Amino acid sequence: DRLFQSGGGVSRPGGSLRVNCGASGFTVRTHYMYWLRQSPGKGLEWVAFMNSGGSVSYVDSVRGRFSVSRDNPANAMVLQMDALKIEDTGTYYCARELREAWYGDLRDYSGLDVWGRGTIVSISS
Amino acid sequence: LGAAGSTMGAASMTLTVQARNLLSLTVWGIKQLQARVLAVERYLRDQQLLGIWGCSGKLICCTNVPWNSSWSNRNLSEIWDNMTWLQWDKEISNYTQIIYGLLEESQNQQEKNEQDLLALD
Amino acid sequence: LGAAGSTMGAASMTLTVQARNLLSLTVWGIKQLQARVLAVERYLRDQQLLGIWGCSGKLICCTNVPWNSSWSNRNLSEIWDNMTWLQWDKEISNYTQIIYGLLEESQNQQEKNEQDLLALD
Amino acid sequence: LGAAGSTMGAASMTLTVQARNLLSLTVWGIKQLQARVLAVERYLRDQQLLGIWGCSGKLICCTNVPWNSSWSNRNLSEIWDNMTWLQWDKEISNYTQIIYGLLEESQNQQEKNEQDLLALD
Amino acid sequence: ENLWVTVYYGVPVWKEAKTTLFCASDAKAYEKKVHNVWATHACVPTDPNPQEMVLKNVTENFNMWKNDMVDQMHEDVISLWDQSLKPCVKLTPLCVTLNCTNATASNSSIIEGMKNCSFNITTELRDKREKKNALFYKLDIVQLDGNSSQYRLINCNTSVITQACPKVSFDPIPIHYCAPAGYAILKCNNKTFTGTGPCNNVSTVQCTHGIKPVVSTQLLLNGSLAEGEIIIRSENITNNVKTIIVHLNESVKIECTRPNNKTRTSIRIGPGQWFYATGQVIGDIREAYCNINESKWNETLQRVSKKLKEYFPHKNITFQPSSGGDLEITTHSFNCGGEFFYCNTSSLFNRTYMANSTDMANSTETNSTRTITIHCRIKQIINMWQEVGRAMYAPPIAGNITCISNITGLLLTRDGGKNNTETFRPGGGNMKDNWRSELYKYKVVKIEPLGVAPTRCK
Amino acid sequence: IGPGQWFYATGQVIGDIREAYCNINESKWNETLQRVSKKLKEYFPHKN
Amino acid sequence: TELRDKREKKNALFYKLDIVQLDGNSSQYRLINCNTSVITQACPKVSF
Ligand SMILES: *[C@@H]1O[C@H](CO)[C@@H](O[C@@H]2O[C@H](CO)[C@@H](O[C@@H]3O[C@H](CO[C@H]4O[C@H](CO)[C@@H](O)[C@H](O)[C@@H]4O)[C@@H](O)[C@H](O[C@H]4O[C@H](CO)[C@@H](O)[C@H](O)[C@@H]4O)[C@@H]3O)[C@H](O)[C@H]2NC(C)=O)[C@H](O)[C@H]1NC(C)=O
Ligand SMILES: *[C@@H]1O[C@H](CO)[C@@H](O[C@@H]2O[C@H](CO)[C@@H](O[C@@H]3O[C@H](CO)[C@@H](O)[C@H](O[C@H]4O[C@H](CO)[C@@H](O)[C@H](O)[C@@H]4O)[C@@H]3O)[C@H](O)[C@H]2NC(C)=O)[C@H](O)[C@H]1NC(C)=O
Ligand SMILES: *[C@@H]1O[C@H](CO)[C@@H](O[C@@H]2O[C@H](CO)[C@@H](O[C@@H]3O[C@H](CO)[C@@H](O)[C@H](O)[C@@H]3O)[C@H](O)[C@H]2NC(C)=O)[C@H](O)[C@H]1NC(C)=O
Ligand SMILES: *[C@@H]1O[C@H](CO)[C@@H](O[C@@H]2O[C@H](CO)[C@@H](O[C@@H]3O[C@H](CO)[C@@H](O)[C@H](O)[C@@H]3O)[C@H](O)[C@H]2NC(C)=O)[C@H](O)[C@H]1NC(C)=O
Ligand SMILES: *[C@@H]1O[C@H](CO)[C@@H](O[C@@H]2O[C@H](CO)[C@@H](O[C@@H]3O[C@H](CO)[C@@H](O)[C@H](O)[C@@H]3O)[C@H](O)[C@H]2NC(C)=O)[C@H](O)[C@H]1NC(C)=O
Ligand SMILES: *[C@@H]1O[C@H](CO)[C@@H](O[C@@H]2O[C@H](CO)[C@@H](O[C@@H]3O[C@H](CO)[C@@H](O)[C@H](O)[C@@H]3O)[C@H](O)[C@H]2NC(C)=O)[C@H](O)[C@H]1NC(C)=O
Ligand SMILES: *[C@@H]1O[C@H](CO)[C@@H](O[C@@H]2O[C@H](CO)[C@@H](O[C@@H]3O[C@H](CO)[C@@H](O)[C@H](O)[C@@H]3O)[C@H](O)[C@H]2NC(C)=O)[C@H](O)[C@H]1NC(C)=O
Ligand SMILES: *[C@@H]1O[C@H](CO)[C@@H](O[C@@H]2O[C@H](CO)[C@@H](O)[C@H](O)[C@H]2NC(C)=O)[C@H](O)[C@H]1NC(C)=O
Ligand SMILES: *[C@@H]1O[C@H](CO)[C@@H](O[C@@H]2O[C@H](CO)[C@@H](O)[C@H](O)[C@H]2NC(C)=O)[C@H](O)[C@H]1NC(C)=O
Ligand SMILES: *[C@@H]1O[C@H](CO)[C@@H](O[C@@H]2O[C@H](CO)[C@@H](O)[C@H](O)[C@H]2NC(C)=O)[C@H](O)[C@H]1NC(C)=O
Ligand SMILES: *[C@@H]1O[C@H](CO)[C@@H](O[C@@H]2O[C@H](CO)[C@@H](O)[C@H](O)[C@H]2NC(C)=O)[C@H](O)[C@H]1NC(C)=O
Ligand SMILES: *[C@@H]1O[C@H](CO)[C@@H](O[C@@H]2O[C@H](CO)[C@@H](O)[C@H](O)[C@H]2NC(C)=O)[C@H](O)[C@H]1NC(C)=O
Ligand SMILES: *[C@@H]1O[C@H](CO)[C@@H](O[C@@H]2O[C@H](CO)[C@@H](O)[C@H](O)[C@H]2NC(C)=O)[C@H](O)[C@H]1NC(C)=O
Ligand SMILES: *[C@@H]1O[C@H](CO)[C@@H](O)[C@H](O)[C@H]1NC(C)=O
Ligand SMILES: *[C@@H]1O[C@H](CO)[C@@H](O)[C@H](O)[C@H]1NC(C)=O
Ligand SMILES: *[C@@H]1O[C@H](CO)[C@@H](O)[C@H](O)[C@H]1NC(C)=O
Ligand SMILES: *[C@@H]1O[C@H](CO)[C@@H](O)[C@H](O)[C@H]1NC(C)=O
Ligand SMILES: *[C@@H]1O[C@H](CO)[C@@H](O)[C@H](O)[C@H]1NC(C)=O
Ligand SMILES: *[C@@H]1O[C@H](CO)[C@@H](O)[C@H](O)[C@H]1NC(C)=O
Ligand SMILES: *[C@@H]1O[C@H](CO)[C@@H](O)[C@H](O)[C@H]1NC(C)=O
Ligand SMILES: *[C@@H]1O[C@H](CO)[C@@H](O)[C@H](O)[C@H]1NC(C)=O
Ligand SMILES: *[C@@H]1O[C@H](CO)[C@@H](O)[C@H](O)[C@H]1NC(C)=O
Ligand SMILES: *[C@@H]1O[C@H](CO)[C@@H](O)[C@H](O)[C@H]1NC(C)=O
């Protein structure tokens, strides 16, 4: 399995950007996927999560501004980002998680096993 | 539905109107079935009263039964001119059953017997 | 109800009698519905057998179907004089279905076709 | 059941066929009742449409209603020769309701009124 | 030049319509006086005669992807499985702190969590509680949110768990379907019907053949065979979210077995209640497995690929094992012998197919001696696909288990991307796509016997 | 309470304390009840 | 709850008019209706 990313780039505050995350060896649409970001020299932080079912949860700080969508023909996800702020500047990562939830109910948990190399996003004036 | 307050002669013009409307999950389920079956039962009762009276497919049918003056003394003009069927039914209610009894056999069953006798060898 | 033990000719005089009586909370509720619907079904089956046979509104109807001597050899006098419909039905039971098949189309459907042909241009 | 793909003239020969088949514990119990009552309701609706149209006991009946050329321009030969009732119904669907409205009273109710007038004094 | 109105009654004319269909059963009764099978299938009018009538010069469209009856079938299965557990015992007094070490019979190594799971049970005077023990297959046990010596039932903080009752053990019963009066069931009767478009071959029946309520994961089993060649049906082949259906024309025998035995034991609960569990295990340890004919599998999937490349009329084809999620969507689940099985099928879809490169077939694989073998695990507590929030427990079956089945079809999904090529892997999950795989031959219509036309009379 | 059962209750109360109340237009109430009385005295066609 | 062996001490608030003093020490209290009738919680989807 592998993940590969594209997009990101440069934007003024209030602009819009978009990052693609495509998979190989497995399809996005049937796994647990995570969007995270890391500001330079700082730690990782959660951004978005999409379950196997396709429902998405957002962290409060980007709700109403970030949106994730499935691109099944491309076997990928897309993070669309609008109303960009300075705080959104950093390196973004798309990742796959392996868990065990038998008959719904869970028993076992590995963590994040597949990690994309990250895309750079810079919001500046 | 709309001729009630009218005179009998007037109301007679529109009868198919009623003919159309006479017919056609544990709280209401039993209820709906009871209602629908009751509707079927009443409609078929009326159809059977026709079948014995003849006049099966005719909303109006005229037949050989003489009318009793003792049931009412009123003139045809008076009865068809300025009265509603509501009032008429009220007056006739008492003799209604006797009328039904006479009309059921003396009219139609004598007819059937004598009719097959006519064609009889 | 009261002519069974009588002779066929006698029993024939009283037929509307049956005609009147042929028709019309979790333990009995389903039961009542089943019974009422069954009654409706049987009555309508008979009505449909008439509708195909014609004779819709006539408890007696005579029509162009010749009788087979092979079904029975008995005299009309013998059959109508001193026999109950109970016994008659027993003898005819075997050919009843064939009789129904013949009477259903050869009599009435040929009639309909040839009749509209008569009025046809 | 077996004349659908046939031409209208052909299909007309066999109609009693449909006439016979048109009619006749908590999971299915309610279901069976719903189905049977629905069947009764549809059959009686059709019977009532006849009763208002007349033609009660006749699978074919011809009556005084002129046909509109605007509903269709096709020849009788063309319509009865090489078409299925499926297609015919599709073309007539739009004017079906108007046809029913006209046939329901202008034909049969005018008939009843004028007929009793003829026998009237 | 006279054209008057005429009416006909009894016209052979119909329309597509939504309605309710009714079950019909076989002559042999269940004879167990159970509400959900006997009073639901064995009390239903039996042996309907499919005196089918073929129709000359008739054309009709059949949409198997959109129809109105598959839902009812889903509906009935859910209703039955709900009714099944109505009268038998709940296990609420059981989900308690479990003290379970790991041991086994003669030599411990295999458990895998089962042996001597101990628990306190108060029975039957509600004052004299006793210490009992029993074995539960490891995958049904969770570690308690605390000390590792403590364990819990898998589902008990979340849902109610019920034991299945011995008279209610449900095996497939072929269900026929009948329409009410005024309604008719039509079959496209084609040998190459793909599930859409017009069909120049129509007949009608008063009754459909029996279809068994078989619950399945990926593979299609106990099913009917295609008449001609293997047939591939998809709502939209170019859409990547649409499940692909493979209907074989030749069955493939699969043989599964649980070769060990288990001694059934019972712990009383109260007045008419007992929890059934595994006692001693006898005697040798082997994992349950399944066996397949290599060559048949092989030629089969080859023809599958040759037919599949039609819908993607281009570059080569690749199969992959399952990808991930709950093993439900990744393994082969079934219920042979009343116990529930999950087989890792990854070894089965590890092939590729090229164009004209090489076709060495002198092999004839080998003297009927290359049986493909696959490992399986089993379980007891079942959150059936039918519902969430109500788990079924299953009692162990003493002795061993054999089960033999026919393989008839496949439920695949796809993936776009990789280089220039197409990739597929077993999909499944949706129960309806099971039943949609056999109801695809039927449509229901309503009969409107009133019609009008011109004639020359008056 | 158990597998699918929970009792719902009041936790912390926030933040200031006022008794629940209802508000009405005096004049409308007033003219209203006056007309009510004027109509009522018909059925008791007498003293106040 | 929920292992029917590990009972816990909880607390919550009930509007006073719903509480009665127990037939004994004033520190003890009882639900208003519970010696007499069955009390049921209303379910969120069924709010009518
Ligand atoms: C279609 O799908 C089903 C599901 O796997 C398969 O049906 C199985 O078929 C086998 C063989 O016919 C059945 O095995 C038989 O079981 C009988 C007992 O079953 C009853 O009792 C058990 C508890 O003991 C209940 O759980 C069960 O529900 C039944 O109530 C045995 O009596 C049989 O033995 C008889 O036949 C053998 C010879 O075969 C004799 O030697 C014996 O003396 C005896 O006469 C037999 O063991 C199995 O029960 C069926 N399961 C189900 C769920 O129906 C089909 O194989 C499958 N077909 C295809 C093509 O896929
Ligand atoms: C449209 O497609 C349908 C098929 O879906 C087809 O209907 C089938 O027609 C064939 C030939 O006309 C039928 O074959 C025979 O039919 C008789 C009675 O219908 C059966 O008794 C026969 O059974 C014996 O013969 C078989 C060999 O022919 C044996 O294999 C069998 O074991 C019996 O010994 C035989 O089936 C067939 O029955 C029907 N289908 C059904 C369900 O009845 C139709 O002909 C096609 N044509 C058109 C123009 O649409
Ligand atoms: C209870 O279960 C444990 C866990 O399976 C059983 O013992 C385990 O045996 C395996 C097989 O070797 C051990 O895994 C590996 O062992 C090697 C050394 O043998 C070690 O170097 C590896 O790091 C790895 O752990 C496992 O450690 C071992 N666990 C324990 C706790 O001993 C055990 O036999 C079962 N039965 C009991 C404890 O009664
Ligand atoms: C059973 O179903 C198959 C398809 O599932 C039917 O095959 C269909 O046959 C018709 C007529 O032969 C085809 O129409 C033709 O299309 C070609 C173009 O491909 C055109 O050149 C012809 O003039 C004609 O229009 C139709 O395409 C074909 N179906 C498909 C999906 O291609 C078959 O007729 C059915 N009946 C049987 C086998 O008895
Ligand atoms: C199920 O359907 C398959 C797919 O059609 C049937 O496969 C048939 O298998 C035979 C045996 O290999 C094939 O014969 C070969 O045909 C090719 C040309 O097609 C020829 O070049 C070879 O020399 C050899 O004769 C046959 O072609 C093939 N069918 C087709 C359409 O190619 C299989 O028989 C069916 N089985 C059942 C039980 O329905
Ligand atoms: C069956 O599936 C195929 C492939 O998924 C469908 O074709 C695709 O349909 C989508 C939706 O209409 C097209 O997306 C559109 O792309 C244009 C490109 O400019 C864009 O402007 C639109 O906003 C929209 O995103 C897609 O291009 C098209 N691709 C191909 C190769 O046809 C087809 O519609 C499906 N058929 C049915 C009946 O659902
Ligand atoms: C179709 O059935 C054949 C029947 O054996 C299976 O393919 C077989 O796969 C085995 C193991 O990969 C092959 O053994 C290997 O052979 C190669 C030379 O071909 C050798 O370099 C390896 O060291 C090993 O011995 C076997 O030859 C091969 N036989 C054939 C006839 O293909 C397999 O089960 C099926 N094919 C596929 C693609 O799954
Ligand atoms: C309501 O009552 C009046 C009077 O009783 C009816 O008046 C009749 O009106 C029709 C049409 O206008 C005349 O032809 C009659 O000669 C009137 N009769 C009398 C006695 O005035 C009126 O028809 C009644 N309405 C209905 C619906 O019956
Ligand atoms: C019972 O049987 C006797 C004899 O079979 C019937 O007697 C008939 O009586 C009527 C009226 O009294 C006469 O007109 C007949 O001539 C008698 N026939 C014979 C053969 O005696 C009597 O009618 C039968 N009762 C019923 C109700 O049918
Ligand atoms: C199917 O279609 C053909 C042609 O449309 C019909 O052929 C008719 O066959 C009958 C009896 O063999 C002839 O009397 C007609 O003259 C034929 N008509 C034509 C146009 O060929 C055939 O009847 C149709 N089948 C059905 C059941 O309707
Ligand atoms: C589960 O049962 C085992 C088996 O007895 C308990 O292990 C015992 O623990 C006590 C307490 O330390 C020791 O004194 C015994 O020697 C142990 N016996 C064995 C055979 O290991 C274990 O404590 C139990 N777990 C509980 C009660 O939570
Ligand atoms: C049944 O419950 C009893 C009571 O909690 C358990 O026995 C206790 O076990 C602990 C740990 O081993 C001891 O410290 C206590 O002294 C024990 N008390 C009594 C009264 O036995 C027992 O382990 C439980 N057994 C099962 C099978 O659940
Ligand atoms: C497993 O597959 C092989 C080949 O796929 C089967 O071999 C068959 O053997 C019979 C007997 O000579 C031949 O008539 C068949 O033609 C062979 N099949 C094929 C596809 O060539 C073998 O029978 C299969 N095993 C079982 C148990 O059926
Ligand atoms: C009438 O029945 C008698 C038997 O009682 C028989 O003798 C006679 O031949 C029959 N046919 C007649 C009288 O034509
Ligand atoms: C009958 O239909 C034909 C079309 O086939 C048409 O030419 C003709 O005018 C129509 N009317 C007749 C023959 O009166
Ligand atoms: C009937 O009305 C429908 C709905 O407007 C229309 O689609 C159809 O073309 C009409 N047909 C005729 C013959 O008027
Ligand atoms: C039980 O809990 C205590 C509390 O911390 C812990 O020290 C001890 O190791 C636990 N025992 C086991 C077997 O987990
Ligand atoms: C086609 O098959 C060849 C080997 O035969 C393989 O190397 C190649 O990747 C495949 N290409 C496509 C586009 O499927
Ligand atoms: C299964 O049980 C039967 C009956 O007790 C016994 O004869 C047989 O040997 C057992 N088989 C295994 C594999 O334990
Ligand atoms: C149990 O095993 C024996 C021998 O291995 C075998 O004869 C028997 O059929 C098996 N029974 C089942 C139900 O698997
Ligand atoms: C009621 O709750 C909302 C949301 O927690 C809070 O903003 C508001 O101030 C509260 N009002 C009072 C009167 O407590
Ligand atoms: C009527 O109203 C007067 C004041 O206006 C009051 O004093 C008196 O008690 C009332 N009397 C009666 C009989 O209602
Ligand atoms: C509790 O009961 C004892 C028994 O008489 C009594 O003395 C004591 O005052 C009581 N406490 C309260 C708070 O009522």
Author numbering:
A (entry chain I): 2 to 82, 82A, 82B, 82C, 83 to 100, 100A, 100B, 100C, ...
B (entry chain F), C (entry chain B), D (entry chain D): 523 to 546, 568 to 664
E (entry chain C): 32 to 132, 136 to 143, 148 to 150, 152, 154 to 309, 312 to 322, 322A, 323 to 355, ...
F (entry chain E): 309, 312 to 322, 322A, 323 to 355, 357 to 358
G (entry chain E): 163 to 210
What do the study's own words say?
The HIV-1 envelope (Env) undergoes conformational changes during infection. The M1214_N1 clone exhibited the best breadth (65%) and potency (0.19 μg/mL geometric mean 50% inhibitory concentration [IC50]) against the 120 Env panel, followed by the M4008_N1 clone with 42% breadth and 0.77 μg/mL potency and the M1214_N2 clone with 31% breadth and 0.16 μg/mL potency.
We further determined the epitope of M1214_N1 by deriving a 4.86-Å-resolution cryogenic electron microscopy (cryo-EM) structure of the antigen-binding fragment (Fab) of M1214_N1 in complex with the CH505 SOSIP trimer. However, M1214_N1 approached the CD4-binding loop from the opposite (the other) side of that contacted by CD4 and CD4bs-directed bNAbs. M1214_N1 interacted with gp120 primarily through its heavy chain, which contributed almost 80% of the buried surface area of the antibody Fab. A long 18 amino acid (aa) CDR H3 loop (by Kabat definition) reached to a valley below the V1V2 β barrel (Gorman et al., 2016, Pan et al., 2015), contacting a short turn (the integrin binding site kink) (Pan et al., 2015) between the V1V2 C and C’ strands. The heavy chain of M1214_N1 also contacted V5 via CDR H2. Together with its contacts on the V1V2 β barrel, the binding of M1214_N1 stabilized the “closed” conformation of the prefusion Env trimer, as evidenced by reduced binding of mAbs that preferentially recognize the “open” Env conformation, such as anti-V3 crown mAbs 447-52D (Gorny et al., 1992) and AD358_b7 (Jia et al., 2016), as well as mAb 17b (Kwong et al., 1998) that recognizes the co-receptor-binding site (CoRbs).
